[PDB]
Amino acid sequence: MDEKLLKTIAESKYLVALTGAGVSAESGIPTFRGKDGLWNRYRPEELANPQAFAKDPEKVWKWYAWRMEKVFNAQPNKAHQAFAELERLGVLKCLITQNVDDLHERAGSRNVIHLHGSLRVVRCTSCNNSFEVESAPKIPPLPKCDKCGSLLRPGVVWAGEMLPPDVLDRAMREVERADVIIVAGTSAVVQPAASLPLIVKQRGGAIIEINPDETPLTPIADYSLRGKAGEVMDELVRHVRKALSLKLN
Ligand SMILES: Nc1ncnc2c1ncn2[C@@H]1O[C@H](COP(=O)(O)OP(=O)(O)OC[C@H]2O[C@H](O)[C@H](O)[C@@H]2O)[C@@H](O)[C@H]1O
Ligand SMILES: [Zn+2]
């Protein structure tokens, strides 16, 4: 947290961010990997997989209904608020997230790309129909599509499935125009999300990583703040706002 870092952010021409589950940990939502990580307890192959869903839809839906209620009842934390503020200040141009929660939106973020879908979305397994929910469904019974005759599924992307072409393309266009990218709360192992910060770097841009742990991205991160996103982003945006207020215009 030096003056060079604050300058890099405050004077950026097109700053973007890539966030992961770590930015929602301080809202009481568990991460997937690391301490208390969901994948250290549960098995992805049995809960977040198309095969697992076809094998036991009730088991998968009960788990997601639980995840949904938790997220819908959680509140955005200081990290979410900071990203929203950085956007309000006109510094953050776009926020790309791997999170399926809607905490960035509830904090006020306007330009958000959801690479892996959203828990607010439910879609049909057969026909092209999807919609958003206000609260979690009760399981059983299994959610069915009213349009046709098939089951509904959470509108998130599971391992092995393809991200919507337009979603990845939009995210790529954003990082291709960015000179600075803040990468917060992500383990940097899941693709293609993990490759996005590399585009910024290969283009001569700067990477600012915020994570209490080192990741595969750390070696190339211009700055890597070993702390919690809530504390780090709050202080960061506070300093950035002060810097911007001093600008002669
Ligand atoms: N308070 C915190 N502030 C910032 N980072 C934190 C915090 N607490 C934990 N982290 C960091 O968050 C990271 C979370 O890593 P993951 O649990 O793997 O979450 P993510 O990178 O978003 O996962 C990628 C994707 O895989 C999943 O399967 C899922 O589909 C998900 O979207 C970890 O590196 C961890 O150290
Ligand atoms: Zn249908």
PDB file of C-alpha atoms and ligand atoms in Angstrom:
ATOM      1  CA  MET A   1       0.000   0.000   0.000  1.00  0.00           C
ATOM      2  CA  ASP A   2       2.456   2.647  -1.180  1.00  0.00           C
ATOM      3  CA  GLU A   3       2.078   5.858  -3.178  1.00  0.00           C
ATOM      4  CA  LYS A   4       3.043   4.072  -6.391  1.00  0.00           C
ATOM      5  CA  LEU A   5       0.073   1.740  -5.992  1.00  0.00           C
ATOM      6  CA  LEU A   6      -2.341   4.563  -5.184  1.00  0.00           C
ATOM      7  CA  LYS A   7      -1.031   6.455  -8.214  1.00  0.00           C
ATOM      8  CA  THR A   8      -1.450   3.451 -10.506  1.00  0.00           C
ATOM      9  CA  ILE A   9      -5.122   3.224  -9.536  1.00  0.00           C
ATOM     10  CA  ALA A  10      -6.014   6.907  -9.271  1.00  0.00           C
ATOM     11  CA  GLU A  11      -4.354   7.746 -12.592  1.00  0.00           C
ATOM     12  CA  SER A  12      -5.622   4.712 -14.515  1.00  0.00           C
ATOM     13  CA  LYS A  13      -7.327   5.298 -17.870  1.00  0.00           C
ATOM     14  CA  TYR A  14      -9.426   2.130 -17.907  1.00  0.00           C
ATOM     15  CA  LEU A  15      -9.408   0.088 -14.712  1.00  0.00           C
ATOM     16  CA  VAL A  16     -11.332  -3.173 -14.440  1.00  0.00           C
ATOM     17  CA  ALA A  17     -11.609  -5.846 -11.779  1.00  0.00           C
ATOM     18  CA  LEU A  18     -11.919  -9.604 -11.624  1.00  0.00           C
ATOM     19  CA  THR A  19     -13.367 -10.935  -8.385  1.00  0.00           C
ATOM     20  CA  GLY A  20     -13.825 -14.381  -6.898  1.00  0.00           C
ATOM     21  CA  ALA A  21     -15.496 -15.995  -3.868  1.00  0.00           C
ATOM     22  CA  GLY A  22     -13.044 -14.349  -1.488  1.00  0.00           C
ATOM     23  CA  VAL A  23     -14.723 -10.964  -1.852  1.00  0.00           C
ATOM     24  CA  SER A  24     -17.935 -12.397  -0.379  1.00  0.00           C
ATOM     25  CA  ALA A  25     -16.337 -14.330   2.476  1.00  0.00           C
ATOM     26  CA  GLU A  26     -16.715 -11.327   4.775  1.00  0.00           C
ATOM     27  CA  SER A  27     -20.478 -11.427   4.129  1.00  0.00           C
ATOM     28  CA  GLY A  28     -20.635 -14.880   5.697  1.00  0.00           C
ATOM     29  CA  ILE A  29     -20.671 -16.730   2.376  1.00  0.00           C
ATOM     30  CA  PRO A  30     -18.199 -19.653   2.248  1.00  0.00           C
ATOM     31  CA  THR A  31     -15.526 -19.823  -0.445  1.00  0.00           C
ATOM     32  CA  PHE A  32     -14.933 -22.908  -2.588  1.00  0.00           C
ATOM     33  CA  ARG A  33     -11.246 -23.440  -1.825  1.00  0.00           C
ATOM     34  CA  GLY A  34      -9.117 -22.746   1.229  1.00  0.00           C
ATOM     35  CA  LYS A  35     -10.220 -22.422   4.853  1.00  0.00           C
ATOM     36  CA  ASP A  36     -13.808 -23.642   5.220  1.00  0.00           C
ATOM     37  CA  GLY A  37     -13.950 -23.976   1.439  1.00  0.00           C
ATOM     38  CA  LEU A  38     -17.056 -25.728   0.107  1.00  0.00           C
ATOM     39  CA  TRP A  39     -14.914 -28.078  -1.991  1.00  0.00           C
ATOM     40  CA  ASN A  40     -12.955 -29.152   1.095  1.00  0.00           C
ATOM     41  CA  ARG A  41     -16.194 -30.443   2.574  1.00  0.00           C
ATOM     42  CA  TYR A  42     -18.540 -31.332  -0.280  1.00  0.00           C
ATOM     43  CA  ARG A  43     -17.638 -32.996  -3.579  1.00  0.00           C
ATOM     44  CA  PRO A  44     -18.158 -30.892  -6.758  1.00  0.00           C
ATOM     45  CA  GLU A  45     -18.614 -34.007  -8.896  1.00  0.00           C
ATOM     46  CA  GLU A  46     -21.776 -34.820  -6.932  1.00  0.00           C
ATOM     47  CA  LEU A  47     -23.270 -31.342  -6.515  1.00  0.00           C
ATOM     48  CA  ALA A  48     -22.046 -28.969  -9.233  1.00  0.00           C
ATOM     49  CA  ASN A  49     -22.006 -31.187 -12.311  1.00  0.00           C
ATOM     50  CA  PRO A  50     -24.533 -31.918 -15.088  1.00  0.00           C
ATOM     51  CA  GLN A  51     -24.088 -35.652 -14.490  1.00  0.00           C
ATOM     52  CA  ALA A  52     -24.659 -35.201 -10.766  1.00  0.00           C
ATOM     53  CA  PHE A  53     -27.798 -33.185 -11.513  1.00  0.00           C
ATOM     54  CA  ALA A  54     -29.143 -35.883 -13.837  1.00  0.00           C
ATOM     55  CA  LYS A  55     -28.340 -38.565 -11.259  1.00  0.00           C
ATOM     56  CA  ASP A  56     -29.916 -36.889  -8.223  1.00  0.00           C
ATOM     57  CA  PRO A  57     -31.704 -33.587  -9.049  1.00  0.00           C
ATOM     58  CA  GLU A  58     -33.300 -33.398  -5.606  1.00  0.00           C
ATOM     59  CA  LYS A  59     -29.933 -33.658  -3.861  1.00  0.00           C
ATOM     60  CA  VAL A  60     -28.467 -30.960  -6.100  1.00  0.00           C
ATOM     61  CA  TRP A  61     -31.496 -28.663  -5.797  1.00  0.00           C
ATOM     62  CA  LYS A  62     -31.638 -28.912  -2.005  1.00  0.00           C
ATOM     63  CA  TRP A  63     -27.976 -27.905  -1.876  1.00  0.00           C
ATOM     64  CA  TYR A  64     -28.518 -24.973  -4.234  1.00  0.00           C
ATOM     65  CA  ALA A  65     -31.709 -23.904  -2.455  1.00  0.00           C
ATOM     66  CA  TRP A  66     -29.554 -23.695   0.677  1.00  0.00           C
ATOM     67  CA  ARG A  67     -26.857 -21.704  -1.140  1.00  0.00           C
ATOM     68  CA  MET A  68     -29.518 -19.377  -2.539  1.00  0.00           C
ATOM     69  CA  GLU A  69     -31.235 -18.625   0.766  1.00  0.00           C
ATOM     70  CA  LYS A  70     -27.830 -17.912   2.332  1.00  0.00           C
ATOM     71  CA  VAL A  71     -26.853 -15.448  -0.398  1.00  0.00           C
ATOM     72  CA  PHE A  72     -30.270 -13.788  -0.586  1.00  0.00           C
ATOM     73  CA  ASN A  73     -30.186 -13.177   3.165  1.00  0.00           C
ATOM     74  CA  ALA A  74     -26.580 -11.957   3.263  1.00  0.00           C
ATOM     75  CA  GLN A  75     -25.540  -8.314   3.085  1.00  0.00           C
ATOM     76  CA  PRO A  76     -22.814  -6.782   0.886  1.00  0.00           C
ATOM     77  CA  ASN A  77     -19.587  -6.244   2.827  1.00  0.00           C
ATOM     78  CA  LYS A  78     -16.976  -3.475   2.772  1.00  0.00           C
ATOM     79  CA  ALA A  79     -15.301  -4.991  -0.304  1.00  0.00           C
ATOM     80  CA  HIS A  80     -18.530  -4.923  -2.306  1.00  0.00           C
ATOM     81  CA  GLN A  81     -19.177  -1.346  -1.193  1.00  0.00           C
ATOM     82  CA  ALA A  82     -15.639  -0.309  -2.163  1.00  0.00           C
ATOM     83  CA  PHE A  83     -15.947  -1.706  -5.680  1.00  0.00           C
ATOM     84  CA  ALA A  84     -19.280   0.104  -6.051  1.00  0.00           C
ATOM     85  CA  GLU A  85     -17.734   3.358  -4.851  1.00  0.00           C
ATOM     86  CA  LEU A  86     -14.709   2.987  -7.130  1.00  0.00           C
ATOM     87  CA  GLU A  87     -17.199   2.748  -9.992  1.00  0.00           C
ATOM     88  CA  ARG A  88     -19.200   5.750  -8.774  1.00  0.00           C
ATOM     89  CA  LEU A  89     -15.959   7.755  -8.709  1.00  0.00           C
ATOM     90  CA  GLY A  90     -15.521   6.893 -12.383  1.00  0.00           C
ATOM     91  CA  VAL A  91     -12.340   4.871 -11.895  1.00  0.00           C
ATOM     92  CA  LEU A  92     -13.665   1.311 -12.162  1.00  0.00           C
ATOM     93  CA  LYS A  93     -15.101   0.804 -15.659  1.00  0.00           C
ATOM     94  CA  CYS A  94     -16.240  -2.802 -15.387  1.00  0.00           C
ATOM     95  CA  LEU A  95     -16.372  -5.509 -12.737  1.00  0.00           C
ATOM     96  CA  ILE A  96     -15.976  -9.089 -13.940  1.00  0.00           C
ATOM     97  CA  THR A  97     -16.918 -11.691 -11.371  1.00  0.00           C
ATOM     98  CA  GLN A  98     -16.884 -15.457 -11.037  1.00  0.00           C
ATOM     99  CA  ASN A  99     -19.315 -15.173  -8.129  1.00  0.00           C
ATOM    100  CA  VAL A 100     -22.856 -16.410  -8.518  1.00  0.00           C
ATOM    101  CA  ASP A 101     -24.068 -14.247  -5.621  1.00  0.00           C
ATOM    102  CA  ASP A 102     -25.606 -10.818  -6.298  1.00  0.00           C
ATOM    103  CA  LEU A 103     -23.744  -8.895  -3.599  1.00  0.00           C
ATOM    104  CA  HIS A 104     -21.884  -6.666  -6.062  1.00  0.00           C
ATOM    105  CA  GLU A 105     -25.243  -5.607  -7.515  1.00  0.00           C
ATOM    106  CA  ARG A 106     -26.835  -5.028  -4.117  1.00  0.00           C
ATOM    107  CA  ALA A 107     -23.864  -2.852  -3.157  1.00  0.00           C
ATOM    108  CA  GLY A 108     -24.664  -0.667  -6.152  1.00  0.00           C
ATOM    109  CA  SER A 109     -22.287  -1.943  -8.841  1.00  0.00           C
ATOM    110  CA  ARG A 110     -23.774  -1.204 -12.272  1.00  0.00           C
ATOM    111  CA  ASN A 111     -21.421  -2.736 -14.855  1.00  0.00           C
ATOM    112  CA  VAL A 112     -21.042  -6.363 -13.771  1.00  0.00           C
ATOM    113  CA  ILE A 113     -20.247  -9.393 -15.925  1.00  0.00           C
ATOM    114  CA  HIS A 114     -21.150 -12.758 -14.378  1.00  0.00           C
ATOM    115  CA  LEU A 115     -18.774 -15.278 -15.941  1.00  0.00           C
ATOM    116  CA  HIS A 116     -20.270 -18.273 -14.140  1.00  0.00           C
ATOM    117  CA  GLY A 117     -23.940 -17.370 -14.031  1.00  0.00           C
ATOM    118  CA  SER A 118     -26.022 -16.364 -11.040  1.00  0.00           C
ATOM    119  CA  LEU A 119     -27.998 -17.879  -8.171  1.00  0.00           C
ATOM    120  CA  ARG A 120     -30.726 -15.333  -8.959  1.00  0.00           C
ATOM    121  CA  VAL A 121     -31.299 -17.144 -12.248  1.00  0.00           C
ATOM    122  CA  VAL A 122     -33.137 -20.419 -12.845  1.00  0.00           C
ATOM    123  CA  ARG A 123     -33.517 -21.930 -16.300  1.00  0.00           C
ATOM    124  CA  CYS A 124     -35.118 -24.863 -18.067  1.00  0.00           C
ATOM    125  CA  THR A 125     -32.965 -27.895 -18.840  1.00  0.00           C
ATOM    126  CA  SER A 126     -34.576 -28.280 -22.266  1.00  0.00           C
ATOM    127  CA  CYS A 127     -36.332 -25.215 -23.696  1.00  0.00           C
ATOM    128  CA  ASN A 128     -34.733 -21.775 -23.978  1.00  0.00           C
ATOM    129  CA  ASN A 129     -36.377 -20.215 -20.936  1.00  0.00           C
ATOM    130  CA  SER A 130     -34.906 -18.536 -17.871  1.00  0.00           C
ATOM    131  CA  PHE A 131     -35.976 -16.029 -15.243  1.00  0.00           C
ATOM    132  CA  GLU A 132     -34.892 -14.574 -11.914  1.00  0.00           C
ATOM    133  CA  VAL A 133     -36.133 -15.416  -8.435  1.00  0.00           C
ATOM    134  CA  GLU A 134     -36.687 -13.240  -5.365  1.00  0.00           C
ATOM    135  CA  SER A 135     -36.302 -16.036  -2.835  1.00  0.00           C
ATOM    136  CA  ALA A 136     -35.164 -19.649  -2.677  1.00  0.00           C
ATOM    137  CA  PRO A 137     -37.561 -22.418  -3.744  1.00  0.00           C
ATOM    138  CA  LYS A 138     -38.663 -25.158  -1.342  1.00  0.00           C
ATOM    139  CA  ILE A 139     -37.330 -28.627  -2.186  1.00  0.00           C
ATOM    140  CA  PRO A 140     -39.161 -30.888  -2.666  1.00  0.00           C
ATOM    141  CA  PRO A 141     -40.934 -30.681  -4.982  1.00  0.00           C
ATOM    142  CA  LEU A 142     -38.433 -30.434  -7.836  1.00  0.00           C
ATOM    143  CA  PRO A 143     -38.747 -27.130  -9.726  1.00  0.00           C
ATOM    144  CA  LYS A 144     -40.504 -27.614 -13.082  1.00  0.00           C
ATOM    145  CA  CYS A 145     -40.663 -25.392 -16.167  1.00  0.00           C
ATOM    146  CA  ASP A 146     -44.124 -23.962 -16.862  1.00  0.00           C
ATOM    147  CA  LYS A 147     -43.290 -23.266 -20.516  1.00  0.00           C
ATOM    148  CA  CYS A 148     -42.894 -26.942 -21.399  1.00  0.00           C
ATOM    149  CA  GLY A 149     -42.495 -30.201 -19.508  1.00  0.00           C
ATOM    150  CA  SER A 150     -39.079 -30.500 -17.882  1.00  0.00           C
ATOM    151  CA  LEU A 151     -37.135 -29.642 -14.732  1.00  0.00           C
ATOM    152  CA  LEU A 152     -35.565 -26.284 -13.962  1.00  0.00           C
ATOM    153  CA  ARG A 153     -31.932 -25.946 -12.908  1.00  0.00           C
ATOM    154  CA  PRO A 154     -29.837 -23.242 -11.226  1.00  0.00           C
ATOM    155  CA  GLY A 155     -28.634 -20.680 -13.751  1.00  0.00           C
ATOM    156  CA  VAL A 156     -24.960 -21.181 -12.931  1.00  0.00           C
ATOM    157  CA  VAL A 157     -22.186 -22.723 -15.024  1.00  0.00           C
ATOM    158  CA  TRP A 158     -20.914 -26.109 -13.835  1.00  0.00           C
ATOM    159  CA  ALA A 159     -17.463 -27.602 -14.394  1.00  0.00           C
ATOM    160  CA  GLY A 160     -17.269 -28.975 -17.916  1.00  0.00           C
ATOM    161  CA  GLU A 161     -20.022 -26.718 -19.238  1.00  0.00           C
ATOM    162  CA  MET A 162     -19.322 -23.809 -21.578  1.00  0.00           C
ATOM    163  CA  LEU A 163     -19.694 -20.177 -20.576  1.00  0.00           C
ATOM    164  CA  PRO A 164     -22.063 -18.246 -22.851  1.00  0.00           C
ATOM    165  CA  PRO A 165     -19.987 -17.050 -25.846  1.00  0.00           C
ATOM    166  CA  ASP A 166     -21.199 -13.464 -25.459  1.00  0.00           C
ATOM    167  CA  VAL A 167     -20.280 -13.412 -21.757  1.00  0.00           C
ATOM    168  CA  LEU A 168     -16.659 -14.452 -22.243  1.00  0.00           C
ATOM    169  CA  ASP A 169     -16.319 -12.246 -25.324  1.00  0.00           C
ATOM    170  CA  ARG A 170     -17.583  -9.220 -23.391  1.00  0.00           C
ATOM    171  CA  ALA A 171     -15.179  -9.890 -20.524  1.00  0.00           C
ATOM    172  CA  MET A 172     -12.291 -10.291 -22.957  1.00  0.00           C
ATOM    173  CA  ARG A 173     -13.116  -6.995 -24.662  1.00  0.00           C
ATOM    174  CA  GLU A 174     -13.028  -5.317 -21.262  1.00  0.00           C
ATOM    175  CA  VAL A 175      -9.591  -6.660 -20.279  1.00  0.00           C
ATOM    176  CA  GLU A 176      -8.280  -5.894 -23.762  1.00  0.00           C
ATOM    177  CA  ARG A 177      -8.934  -2.188 -23.179  1.00  0.00           C
ATOM    178  CA  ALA A 178      -7.794  -2.047 -19.530  1.00  0.00           C
ATOM    179  CA  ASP A 179      -4.467  -0.652 -18.318  1.00  0.00           C
ATOM    180  CA  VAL A 180      -4.989  -1.823 -14.735  1.00  0.00           C
ATOM    181  CA  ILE A 181      -6.852  -4.791 -13.255  1.00  0.00           C
ATOM    182  CA  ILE A 182      -7.624  -5.463  -9.594  1.00  0.00           C
ATOM    183  CA  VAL A 183      -7.848  -9.230  -9.006  1.00  0.00           C
ATOM    184  CA  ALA A 184      -9.493  -9.879  -5.645  1.00  0.00           C
ATOM    185  CA  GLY A 185     -10.585 -12.973  -3.779  1.00  0.00           C
ATOM    186  CA  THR A 186      -9.798 -15.588  -6.401  1.00  0.00           C
ATOM    187  CA  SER A 187      -7.575 -18.674  -6.317  1.00  0.00           C
ATOM    188  CA  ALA A 188      -6.585 -18.155  -9.961  1.00  0.00           C
ATOM    189  CA  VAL A 189      -6.908 -21.820 -10.964  1.00  0.00           C
ATOM    190  CA  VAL A 190     -10.267 -22.042 -12.754  1.00  0.00           C
ATOM    191  CA  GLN A 191     -10.212 -21.278 -16.490  1.00  0.00           C
ATOM    192  CA  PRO A 192     -10.944 -19.333 -18.552  1.00  0.00           C
ATOM    193  CA  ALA A 193     -11.409 -16.756 -15.787  1.00  0.00           C
ATOM    194  CA  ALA A 194      -7.835 -17.141 -14.524  1.00  0.00           C
ATOM    195  CA  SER A 195      -6.487 -16.181 -17.956  1.00  0.00           C
ATOM    196  CA  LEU A 196      -8.168 -12.762 -18.042  1.00  0.00           C
ATOM    197  CA  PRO A 197      -5.565 -10.937 -15.892  1.00  0.00           C
ATOM    198  CA  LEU A 198      -2.837 -12.297 -18.166  1.00  0.00           C
ATOM    199  CA  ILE A 199      -4.294 -10.372 -21.099  1.00  0.00           C
ATOM    200  CA  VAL A 200      -3.864  -7.106 -19.195  1.00  0.00           C
ATOM    201  CA  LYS A 201      -0.272  -8.006 -18.314  1.00  0.00           C
ATOM    202  CA  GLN A 202       0.681  -9.167 -21.813  1.00  0.00           C
ATOM    203  CA  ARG A 203      -0.610  -5.800 -23.013  1.00  0.00           C
ATOM    204  CA  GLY A 204       1.740  -3.945 -20.671  1.00  0.00           C
ATOM    205  CA  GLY A 205      -0.894  -3.263 -18.037  1.00  0.00           C
ATOM    206  CA  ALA A 206      -0.647  -3.686 -14.280  1.00  0.00           C
ATOM    207  CA  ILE A 207      -2.112  -6.366 -12.025  1.00  0.00           C
ATOM    208  CA  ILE A 208      -3.119  -5.574  -8.443  1.00  0.00           C
ATOM    209  CA  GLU A 209      -3.870  -8.799  -6.561  1.00  0.00           C
ATOM    210  CA  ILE A 210      -5.737  -8.762  -3.235  1.00  0.00           C
ATOM    211  CA  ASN A 211      -5.772 -12.100  -1.432  1.00  0.00           C
ATOM    212  CA  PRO A 212      -4.772 -13.413   2.041  1.00  0.00           C
ATOM    213  CA  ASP A 213      -2.962 -16.236   0.231  1.00  0.00           C
ATOM    214  CA  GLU A 214      -0.507 -16.433  -2.658  1.00  0.00           C
ATOM    215  CA  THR A 215      -1.904 -17.810  -5.921  1.00  0.00           C
ATOM    216  CA  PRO A 216      -0.536 -18.865  -9.329  1.00  0.00           C
ATOM    217  CA  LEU A 217      -0.975 -15.223 -10.382  1.00  0.00           C
ATOM    218  CA  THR A 218       1.163 -13.765  -7.586  1.00  0.00           C
ATOM    219  CA  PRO A 219       4.509 -14.120  -9.422  1.00  0.00           C
ATOM    220  CA  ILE A 220       3.355 -11.694 -12.126  1.00  0.00           C
ATOM    221  CA  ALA A 221       1.292  -9.365  -9.955  1.00  0.00           C
ATOM    222  CA  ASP A 222       2.789  -5.852  -9.919  1.00  0.00           C
ATOM    223  CA  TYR A 223       1.272  -5.557  -6.457  1.00  0.00           C
ATOM    224  CA  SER A 224      -0.007  -8.379  -4.264  1.00  0.00           C
ATOM    225  CA  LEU A 225      -1.651  -7.302  -1.013  1.00  0.00           C
ATOM    226  CA  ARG A 226      -1.748 -10.215   1.434  1.00  0.00           C
ATOM    227  CA  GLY A 227      -4.942  -9.289   3.266  1.00  0.00           C
ATOM    228  CA  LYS A 228      -8.747  -9.374   3.338  1.00  0.00           C
ATOM    229  CA  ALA A 229     -10.606  -7.630   0.508  1.00  0.00           C
ATOM    230  CA  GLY A 230     -12.876  -5.794   2.921  1.00  0.00           C
ATOM    231  CA  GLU A 231     -10.073  -4.074   4.818  1.00  0.00           C
ATOM    232  CA  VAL A 232      -7.801  -3.593   1.813  1.00  0.00           C
ATOM    233  CA  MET A 233     -10.394  -2.278  -0.654  1.00  0.00           C
ATOM    234  CA  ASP A 234     -11.960   0.029   1.924  1.00  0.00           C
ATOM    235  CA  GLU A 235      -8.660   1.748   2.662  1.00  0.00           C
ATOM    236  CA  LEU A 236      -7.693   1.713  -1.011  1.00  0.00           C
ATOM    237  CA  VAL A 237     -10.859   3.443  -2.234  1.00  0.00           C
ATOM    238  CA  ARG A 238     -10.702   5.909   0.653  1.00  0.00           C
ATOM    239  CA  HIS A 239      -7.217   6.944  -0.459  1.00  0.00           C
ATOM    240  CA  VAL A 240      -8.196   6.986  -4.123  1.00  0.00           C
ATOM    241  CA  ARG A 241     -11.184   9.248  -3.426  1.00  0.00           C
ATOM    242  CA  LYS A 242      -8.921  11.641  -1.504  1.00  0.00           C
ATOM    243  CA  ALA A 243      -6.450  11.721  -4.397  1.00  0.00           C
ATOM    244  CA  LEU A 244      -9.198  12.413  -6.924  1.00  0.00           C
ATOM    245  CA  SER A 245     -10.567  15.247  -4.765  1.00  0.00           C
ATOM    246  CA  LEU A 246      -7.194  17.007  -5.025  1.00  0.00           C
ATOM    247  CA  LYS A 247      -7.231  17.054  -8.831  1.00  0.00           C
ATOM    248  CA  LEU A 248      -7.357  20.507 -10.421  1.00  0.00           C
ATOM    249  CA  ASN A 249     -10.274  20.508 -12.862  1.00  0.00           C
TER     250      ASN A 249
HETATM  251  N1  LIG B   1     -11.598 -12.093   3.085  1.00  0.00           N
HETATM  252  C1  LIG B   1     -11.010 -12.391   1.910  1.00  0.00           C
HETATM  253  N2  LIG B   1     -10.652 -11.374   1.017  1.00  0.00           N
HETATM  254  C2  LIG B   1     -10.042 -11.655  -0.213  1.00  0.00           C
HETATM  255  N3  LIG B   1      -9.784 -12.976  -0.567  1.00  0.00           N
HETATM  256  C3  LIG B   1     -10.131 -14.002   0.298  1.00  0.00           C
HETATM  257  C4  LIG B   1     -10.733 -13.735   1.522  1.00  0.00           C
HETATM  258  N4  LIG B   1     -10.949 -14.893   2.135  1.00  0.00           N
HETATM  259  C5  LIG B   1     -10.491 -15.866   1.304  1.00  0.00           C
HETATM  260  N5  LIG B   1      -9.943 -15.369   0.081  1.00  0.00           N
HETATM  261  C6  LIG B   1      -9.365 -15.932  -1.086  1.00  0.00           C
HETATM  262  O1  LIG B   1     -10.329 -16.196  -1.970  1.00  0.00           O
HETATM  263  C7  LIG B   1      -9.904 -17.145  -2.825  1.00  0.00           C
HETATM  264  C8  LIG B   1     -11.065 -17.958  -3.189  1.00  0.00           C
HETATM  265  O2  LIG B   1     -10.718 -18.948  -4.016  1.00  0.00           O
HETATM  266  P1  LIG B   1     -11.929 -19.926  -4.516  1.00  0.00           P
HETATM  267  O3  LIG B   1     -12.699 -20.556  -3.285  1.00  0.00           O
HETATM  268  O4  LIG B   1     -11.302 -21.049  -5.430  1.00  0.00           O
HETATM  269  O5  LIG B   1     -13.029 -19.045  -5.318  1.00  0.00           O
HETATM  270  P2  LIG B   1     -12.866 -18.639  -6.890  1.00  0.00           P
HETATM  271  O6  LIG B   1     -11.410 -18.164  -7.290  1.00  0.00           O
HETATM  272  O7  LIG B   1     -13.923 -17.503  -7.158  1.00  0.00           O
HETATM  273  O8  LIG B   1     -13.475 -19.983  -7.627  1.00  0.00           O
HETATM  274  C9  LIG B   1     -13.482 -20.090  -9.056  1.00  0.00           C
HETATM  275  C10 LIG B   1     -14.711 -20.787  -9.339  1.00  0.00           C
HETATM  276  O9  LIG B   1     -14.582 -22.171  -8.891  1.00  0.00           O
HETATM  277  C11 LIG B   1     -15.552 -22.605  -8.342  1.00  0.00           C
HETATM  278  O10 LIG B   1     -15.660 -23.878  -8.571  1.00  0.00           O
HETATM  279  C12 LIG B   1     -16.587 -21.880  -8.774  1.00  0.00           C
HETATM  280  O11 LIG B   1     -17.124 -22.237  -9.738  1.00  0.00           O
HETATM  281  C13 LIG B   1     -16.004 -20.607  -8.777  1.00  0.00           C
HETATM  282  O12 LIG B   1     -16.731 -19.635  -9.301  1.00  0.00           O
HETATM  283  C14 LIG B   1      -8.832 -17.824  -2.145  1.00  0.00           C
HETATM  284  O13 LIG B   1      -7.718 -17.693  -2.884  1.00  0.00           O
HETATM  285  C15 LIG B   1      -8.734 -17.202  -0.867  1.00  0.00           C
HETATM  286  O14 LIG B   1      -7.522 -17.149  -0.330  1.00  0.00           O
HETATM  287 ZN    ZN B   2     -38.916 -25.494 -20.456  1.00  0.00          ZN
END
